[PDB]
């Protein structure tokens, strides 16, 4: 039970963070941050400066 609901919640958190980065790139930042890698449920990697 812990494995199933912990894995789902953590990948949900990663999906929320990816959606937030797409909001920041579209609205206010824009090429000051870029998504390098995104594997859904596995990893997210952003590039600044």
């Amino acid at each position: 039970m812990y494995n199933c609901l912990h894995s789902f919640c953590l990948s949900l958190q990663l999906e929320v963070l990816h959606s937030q980065t797409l909001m920041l790139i579209r609205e206010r930042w824009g090429d000051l941050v870029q998504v390098e890698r995104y594997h859904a449920g596995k990893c997210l990697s952003l590039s600044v400066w």
Partner: peptide, 25 residues
């Protein structure tokens, strides 16, 4: 006499949960 349209991503995550954790009767 709704659906907030961020549910595509949640649904793909549900399918990944189905695969990563299968149901067991």
């Amino acid at each position: 006499f709704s659906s907030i349209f961020q549910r595509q991503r949640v649904d793909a995550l549900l399918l990944d949960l189905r695969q990563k954790f299968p149901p067991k009767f």
